[PDB]
Amino acid sequence: VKSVTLITKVFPEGEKVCAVVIEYPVEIDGQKLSPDQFSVKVKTGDTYSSRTITKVYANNSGGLSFSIFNNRGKYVVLELSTEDLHSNTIVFGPNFLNTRMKLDYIVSQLVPIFDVDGNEVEPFTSKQTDEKHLIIDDFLAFTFKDPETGVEIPYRLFVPKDVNPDRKYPLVVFLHGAGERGTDNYLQVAGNRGAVVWAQPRYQVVHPCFVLAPQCPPNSSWSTLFTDNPFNPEKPLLAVIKIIRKLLDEYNIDENRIYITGLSMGGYGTWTAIMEFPELFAAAIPICGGGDVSKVERIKDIPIWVFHAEDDPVVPVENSRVLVKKLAEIGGKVRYTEYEKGFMEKHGWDPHGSWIPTYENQEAIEWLFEQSR
Amino acid sequence: VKSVTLITKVFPEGEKVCAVVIEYPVEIDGQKLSPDQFSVKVKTGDTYSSRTITKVYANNSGGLSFSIFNNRGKYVVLELSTEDLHSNTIVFGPNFLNTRMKLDYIVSQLVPIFDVDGNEVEPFTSKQTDEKHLIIDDFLAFTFKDPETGVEIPYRLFVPKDVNPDRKYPLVVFLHGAGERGTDNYLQVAGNRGAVVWAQPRYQVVHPCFVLAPQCPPNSSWSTLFTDNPFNPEKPLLAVIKIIRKLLDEYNIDENRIYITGLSMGGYGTWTAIMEFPELFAAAIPICGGGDVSKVERIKDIPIWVFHAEDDPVVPVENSRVLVKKLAEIGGKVRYTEYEKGFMEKHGWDPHGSWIPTYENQEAIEWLFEQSR
Amino acid sequence: VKSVTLITKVFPEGEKVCAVVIEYPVEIDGQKLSPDQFSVKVKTGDTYSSRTITKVYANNSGGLSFSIFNNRGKYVVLELSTEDLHSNTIVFGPNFLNTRMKLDYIVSQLVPIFDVDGNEVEPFTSKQTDEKHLIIDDFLAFTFKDPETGVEIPYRLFVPKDVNPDRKYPLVVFLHGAGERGTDNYLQVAGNRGAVVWAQPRYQVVHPCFVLAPQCPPNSSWSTLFTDRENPFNPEKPLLAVIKIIRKLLDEYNIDENRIYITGLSMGGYGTWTAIMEFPELFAAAIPICGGGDVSKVERIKDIPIWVFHAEDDPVVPVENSRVLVKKLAEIGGKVRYTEYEKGFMEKHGWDPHGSWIPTYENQEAIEWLFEQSR
Amino acid sequence: VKSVTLITKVFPEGEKVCAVVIEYPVEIDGQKLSPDQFSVKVKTGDTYSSRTITKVYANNSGGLSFSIFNNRGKYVVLELSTEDLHSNTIVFGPNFLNTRMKLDYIVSQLVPIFDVDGNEVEPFTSKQTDEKHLIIDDFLAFTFKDPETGVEIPYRLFVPKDVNPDRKYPLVVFLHGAGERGTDNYLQVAGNRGAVVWAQPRYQVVHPCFVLAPQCPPNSSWSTLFTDRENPFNPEKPLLAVIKIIRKLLDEYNIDENRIYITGLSMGGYGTWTAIMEFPELFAAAIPICGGGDVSKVERIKDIPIWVFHAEDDPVVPVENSRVLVKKLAEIGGKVRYTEYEKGFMEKHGWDPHGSWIPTYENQEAIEWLFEQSR
Amino acid sequence: VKSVTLITKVFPEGEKVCAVVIEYPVEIDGQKLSPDQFSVKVKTGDTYSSRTITKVYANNSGGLSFSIFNNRGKYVVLELSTEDLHSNTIVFGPNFLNTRMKLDYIVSQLVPIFDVDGNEVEPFTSKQTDEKHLIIDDFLAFTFKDPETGVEIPYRLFVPKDVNPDRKYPLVVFLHGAGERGTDNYLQVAGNRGAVVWAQPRYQVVHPCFVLAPQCPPNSSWSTLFTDRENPFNPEKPLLAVIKIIRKLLDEYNIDENRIYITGLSMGGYGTWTAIMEFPELFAAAIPICGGGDVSKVERIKDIPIWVFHAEDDPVVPVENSRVLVKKLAEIGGKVRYTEYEKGFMEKHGWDPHGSWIPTYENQEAIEWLFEQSR
């Protein structure tokens, strides 16, 4: 068997293994395939536990493309349940610091299966020969060192394809994630849909654009939140602005539509970037953060859509209310969606994670792309 | 008993029997009625199986109008569960060709029931004496023969009521449905809410309008999809344009607001009608189809809202993406709602059936009626 | 449709309607019948509730019989869940007096059905036209007028069938509990399996067998239980009458003076203890279920085989009532057995702990044991 | 991997695959094994379904034995739910003829596992390489050729072990039902616990014991049941042959002429009734389960202890068939017992009411009773 | 509130807290009480979990007694689900040594309640103030000092009540299993129904009865089981001591030398086998449950009635241990019975297969049988 390839996809909750794709040396008859023919298990961290296969099928493609008219062949896709316990690639160890386990899978075809010419294909068992990281393999990895010197900032950059080069396109800049701090240049783009949502074909076909997901080192934050008032720019945020300038230097990016959005720490981060560099950004979506209300007047002309859940037990909701109230009463350009108590838990999410429905809200995506300077 | 009348209503999934209405020769006390007093069963096709009665009540009306203040009399309504196995009137036999069984019901009042003057009304059992087809009996049946000659095209036409005649009103033209092909002049209007949604009082009170649901014969399609590139007009679509001209000839229809929408085969159909007759239509909603991207420039000024689910295993989603991407980058007037993988199955629908949420989306109805030339 | 007949049968917790039999104008093939073609409902008391039909079949007998081989005939049997709420015929009224519901059913064939001839019998709906009381209908009804005391006592008696007139057979006499008191001559045979078990074919065919089941009248009781707060151990008129009727039976029938057994529950349990103690000469063996006791008198019963039953947690009749008789019986040289149902045993099996007669009449060992007794 | 062995065992409703034993090249610690490390599947008939693995453990025996103390060895046992749909080895074909499925399994170790040495045996997948028939493999296979009639009769015989050659022991002869007819010499010992119960260690160790289990051939039957519609009570060739083989056994073995017991079910129940009535001199005691009867002949069997079993609602063999023999037996002076399973009792326990042999062979009282009989 | 008393009772799997009784300052009507007015909780070990209250009622006794008739008094009984996780008093520690939890409860009346006087007792909350050990509190505690060997042996002895001093009565001696070893004199009477069943009123009233339940000390065991890897069949000091104490009892009490019965499980099963084989003259009958054997010695026990019990799949004590003694007993002329619980039987009933003492002490046949034995 040529390979068995784990597929990962970023789900509102974070990155998960959603499929295994097995490459056969012959052409499998999908019609006759079924979940009970295979097993897929995940190592954590010393025993394996089962993954629920929900669907099976086939193609000469080898991503997750199902077609009823030819269910075949070389490639067999086993879909996995995203509700499985160990579906997540990221484990939230006991700080504001998550990590991404190396992926450890064993896969077996359990019984013989029929190929297109009606042979049997014999059982096999195998560890994976691959990962493939969906929409997260299309973000370029880069490093930027703040010279003079010298905080290094890994970042991920999505460049649109294939999109006439004598035109300029928006930049969406994203800020994770206390949990997503680190040095690996992956967490920031995998913790949630913050960076990746903008890169989905559904939105790219209609708002082609760049996305920037920089990564804050451990023990630092975007604002002086974790380094002590928590509202001033900290050197990682400082460095991001410079990365933005480099990107406009290097790429056909529309200076009139640089958008910024961020989450929790990256919430503070968003308010802070707009309040310190207010000529730079065309619009903002700060999610469950705070910022300096004495400085709201600087940003009265930036369209902003604020999000926060009422029952956020990590970042008090009042941190959004206060900015929203001041912004609005001074002539504004502000929206505000304050998720009701119980809403989040009703949808199976920690009430801090208000970024989940926010990035799943097509009204807000569309809104952002209507902004300009 | 004067009659027992099956009521049908078109549900997003298609037409179903949702009630039985029994006409008594005296006036029944609804207060005292209950589901366990009756039985309703459906013949398929050689045994009968039970229908779940969910609610009972009464009136001098005899559609499904429940009133708590007088629960009486002549008329007894038994509501049926739309989740029942054999609730659908249409069976999807093994092609791209569905059919509508003749309706075969037996109904019994099981125990004596009380009338308003406190008599008993004795048990009875009966086959149905009637169908009544809701909002599907308000579409006129007509035939059009393409003279010269001679493909005949049955069609259904909803004419608004009662709406000052010295004014012009929009035409909504709908295209089913590979499955809904046939000759009966019913399938097209019963397969799903494609034609009927526009005719609902909720929308008619505020956007009075005509609707046209023509029917494509078997073995043909709207575009050269099923007759072989699948993007050119096939003679049934050709004939529809002529039916549209006849209708403007015959009816006070606003030439500036002829809207077109369609589904799958009728998806291709929609793109095709706009790309070949671009002066004719004011807006379009193509659902899960494709069309010719070399011809997108002709339609750059037609407002279009495209719909497709990501995991459509019949019509690849890329068929919408490609048109959307080209349309947008050339100056557009295009929306796009690409339902996420898992969305459809989460709501109990085959992921091909993206027309179901689309016609259930009040934003899209309203949108269409804001268009004009 | 010729008739619709309610089939009742006495189950451990009393008599329930277990089947409905419809006599069709022609025969019918049951192979093609199915539960969802019919409906069965009870009234209670001004609405109906459904009986759940668990199997449909056909025979030519009219009872419950079914062979895979010939599932056909003019009779269609609809069997009903015995676990249905409204299956019991007897509503337990207060305080200690039960009443049987006049039975009230409507039945439907809902869809056409195939016949042997055929091919279609049309839907019908109907009240019932007949009860059939399976096993209760083999007990002849009689009334006895006690010529010494006026008291009238209705009774039901089972006479064995196809038995040699030249041999003699045992008599089982059953005394019912308070709740079965009445004047209808039905209750005491339908409230539990107390009379009827002895009359089941499974037992009759190995131990043919008369059964006398007397009814005691609503404002007395077998012993001075309900007719005195001093010592409810003395024989009351109804019990005394029962004796005279045992003697009528002996005169009228080929009954074996040496094997007149006696059992009863609760008020009938006191009844049983009182009977054997006041007439030690009469009975071969006794099964007193939840009753009570003249302890001063166990010496007269020293030689009668007795198997006592009671539940530890009986909240109506303290278990100590059986324990005391058994203790004394035992220490005096006995011929006594005693099964005392553990706390919780009854509710575990879904039974009020007072109803200890329920597992007892279901005990094959107990039945067999009674029959190996004699004088 | 040295072998993968299917363990079958005869359960009350017939023979099921209950375990899969894998012989590994080294020993293994079961302390560290768990059900989710393996997979077990049957074919039927061109797909597989899973057997549910309920416990994993190791021994050095190769059978089902497990001690908490040393959960280790080259053998790994995967125990399987006996409630799985595809556990039975025997598919009930029509009309009255069952067939055993050639067995078809694939087994997997899915993840690496720790060994004693060690530390890793890699995943493998495999068809089985062996059946082991637990208890059916102690019955020697023989065929007898009846020299008077040509008929060939395959039979299985259990010979006791570690028993004194100088004493003599009982013979239990089992006659199987219609469905077990055939020519394979396996069916009649695997279809139910009829032969094998007598051969279980729990009983052998208190009542050592030969068991003869003859097979009757697909187009006849023990009595003139299936070979005549006039009176299916006469001995047919297969039964007659069985007698001759009892005599061979007596000649060849230290069997006690005074304790040749006989039981069978259904066609074997008729068989049993016919055998004892036509050869009253031969058998010490009989257990005929759902069979039928020459009533004219019970006088010859007057002195044979007999315990009849039947279910009231048997839809294949009317219960009246047992009732009639029992009634007569009883009134003539007997030595007859009779347990008749109440309507519903069988389905309550999940059993077709015809299979009354199932609770019967599970009755310790019945087994014990047979062994206290003799001439 | 006068007191809150924990009611414990010995259930087949050991002693559980089954009720909580509250003594109120006045009487109370239980007719008006309901489970949701109270709360009951255990500690374990630094949190509490709820006991589920299944019924509330009142009496004037203080124990579990309830009559429908007078549901009233100063005592309020809260009955608790015996299926609750934290109901057992005994935590099974390692390796083979169990310990009883000091008991730790808090109880609440949550809402006001109506009294007889009345009309309101206010909410209260409280630790318990009392245990009451139902049946374990009828066994007097004693210690014996073996004057030949120093060994001290605690024991519990049940003396019958209201019994004639002039007659003599049986002695049942129970030897507990490894886990009940200790020095507390409680374990061996609370770990299972081994001692206490004989002491239940249901049995006492038909077979009055002493029960001796000795405790063996944590680092030995009745036979040379845990004190030698050569042959664990010899009498160890603790067993020897037990004998001397049987003799003390005979001296001190009206015990019948002809009916000293003996039973024990596991380590107590070995104990039982060893006892009767080394002192054949002493015991009338034995029930050894999952134990093991000096096979060379069964000839001395040839005449002792013995009913052995073991489960086929016991993973601690191989069933072959019972099979071997039974086989020999049988072939030598016996007086031996043997019930061997089938594989799966135990787990089906929710029991570890080693605990075969659980169904055994629940077997009325076994109990009755022991009592018909004598010399």
Tab-separated table of C-alpha atoms in Angstrom, chain D residues 239-343:
chain	number	residue	atom	x	y	z
D	239	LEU	CA	-34.741	-46.577	16.327
D	240	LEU	CA	-34.394	-50.314	15.806
D	241	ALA	CA	-30.869	-49.851	14.790
D	242	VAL	CA	-30.221	-47.753	18.039
D	243	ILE	CA	-31.331	-50.729	20.117
D	244	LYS	CA	-28.834	-53.064	18.435
D	245	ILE	CA	-26.198	-50.500	19.186
D	246	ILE	CA	-27.133	-50.310	22.902
D	247	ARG	CA	-26.445	-54.082	22.846
D	248	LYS	CA	-23.111	-53.680	21.104
D	249	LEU	CA	-22.192	-51.211	23.849
D	250	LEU	CA	-23.231	-53.574	26.635
D	251	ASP	CA	-21.041	-56.203	25.042
D	252	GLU	CA	-18.103	-53.853	24.510
D	253	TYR	CA	-18.244	-51.872	27.778
D	254	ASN	CA	-18.656	-51.892	31.551
D	255	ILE	CA	-22.158	-50.448	31.330
D	256	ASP	CA	-24.807	-51.270	33.935
D	257	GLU	CA	-27.740	-53.170	32.352
D	258	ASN	CA	-29.805	-51.749	35.249
D	259	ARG	CA	-29.290	-48.052	34.468
D	260	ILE	CA	-29.758	-47.458	30.755
D	261	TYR	CA	-31.665	-44.186	30.784
D	262	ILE	CA	-33.171	-42.553	27.736
D	263	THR	CA	-34.222	-39.047	26.724
D	264	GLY	CA	-34.892	-37.115	23.540
D	265	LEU	CA	-36.879	-34.107	22.350
D	266	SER	CA	-39.620	-33.616	19.777
D	267	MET	CA	-38.968	-36.345	17.118
D	268	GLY	CA	-36.633	-37.736	19.793
D	269	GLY	CA	-39.470	-37.393	22.325
D	270	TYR	CA	-41.747	-39.625	20.229
D	271	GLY	CA	-38.618	-41.746	19.848
D	272	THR	CA	-38.250	-42.024	23.619
D	273	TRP	CA	-41.917	-42.896	24.198
D	274	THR	CA	-41.747	-45.520	21.427
D	275	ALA	CA	-38.455	-47.027	22.680
D	276	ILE	CA	-39.598	-47.621	26.234
D	277	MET	CA	-43.012	-48.907	25.216
D	278	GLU	CA	-41.554	-51.327	22.631
D	279	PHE	CA	-38.641	-52.401	24.845
D	280	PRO	CA	-39.898	-52.003	28.408
D	281	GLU	CA	-37.310	-54.395	29.622
D	282	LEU	CA	-34.391	-52.310	28.510
D	283	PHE	CA	-34.590	-48.865	30.191
D	284	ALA	CA	-34.356	-47.792	33.851
D	285	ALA	CA	-35.966	-44.340	33.350
D	286	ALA	CA	-36.969	-41.989	30.550
D	287	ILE	CA	-37.245	-38.208	30.016
D	288	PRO	CA	-39.433	-37.629	26.910
D	289	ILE	CA	-39.508	-33.933	25.976
D	290	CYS	CA	-42.269	-32.708	23.681
D	291	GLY	CA	-43.224	-35.997	22.082
D	292	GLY	CA	-46.170	-38.308	21.505
D	293	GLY	CA	-47.672	-41.475	22.317
D	294	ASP	CA	-49.117	-44.912	21.956
D	295	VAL	CA	-51.686	-44.644	24.741
D	296	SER	CA	-52.856	-48.208	24.370
D	297	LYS	CA	-49.349	-49.237	25.557
D	298	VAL	CA	-48.679	-47.437	28.847
D	299	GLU	CA	-49.410	-50.591	30.790
D	300	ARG	CA	-46.045	-52.085	29.744
D	301	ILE	CA	-44.264	-48.995	31.083
D	302	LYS	CA	-46.249	-48.911	34.315
D	303	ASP	CA	-43.022	-49.529	36.324
D	304	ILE	CA	-40.562	-47.300	34.457
D	305	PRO	CA	-39.867	-43.939	36.220
D	306	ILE	CA	-40.707	-41.245	33.659
D	307	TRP	CA	-40.496	-37.462	33.878
D	308	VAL	CA	-42.331	-35.808	30.999
D	309	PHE	CA	-41.705	-32.167	29.935
D	310	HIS	CA	-43.713	-30.044	27.416
D	311	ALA	CA	-44.668	-26.371	27.088
D	312	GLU	CA	-48.357	-25.494	27.187
D	313	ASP	CA	-48.086	-23.271	24.107
D	314	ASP	CA	-45.832	-25.523	21.965
D	315	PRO	CA	-47.099	-24.613	18.443
D	316	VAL	CA	-45.335	-27.567	16.729
D	317	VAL	CA	-46.200	-30.496	19.042
D	318	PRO	CA	-49.547	-29.968	20.897
D	319	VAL	CA	-49.017	-30.227	24.682
D	320	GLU	CA	-52.005	-32.618	24.763
D	321	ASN	CA	-49.584	-35.192	23.378
D	322	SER	CA	-47.771	-35.307	26.767
D	323	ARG	CA	-50.907	-34.747	28.874
D	324	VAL	CA	-52.578	-37.816	27.478
D	325	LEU	CA	-49.684	-40.195	28.299
D	326	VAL	CA	-49.186	-38.629	31.729
D	327	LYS	CA	-52.919	-38.845	32.622
D	328	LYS	CA	-53.055	-42.560	31.853
D	329	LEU	CA	-49.683	-43.296	33.436
D	330	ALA	CA	-50.917	-41.616	36.591
D	331	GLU	CA	-54.284	-43.397	36.865
D	332	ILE	CA	-52.787	-46.808	36.363
D	333	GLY	CA	-50.261	-46.487	39.194
D	334	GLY	CA	-47.792	-44.361	37.569
D	335	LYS	CA	-44.197	-43.676	38.625
D	336	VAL	CA	-44.597	-40.526	36.419
D	337	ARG	CA	-43.615	-36.850	36.927
D	338	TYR	CA	-44.732	-33.950	34.771
D	339	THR	CA	-43.580	-30.390	34.543
D	340	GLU	CA	-45.597	-28.420	31.949
D	341	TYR	CA	-44.164	-25.005	31.210
D	342	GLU	CA	-46.911	-22.314	31.416
D	343	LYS	CA	-47.972	-20.260	28.372
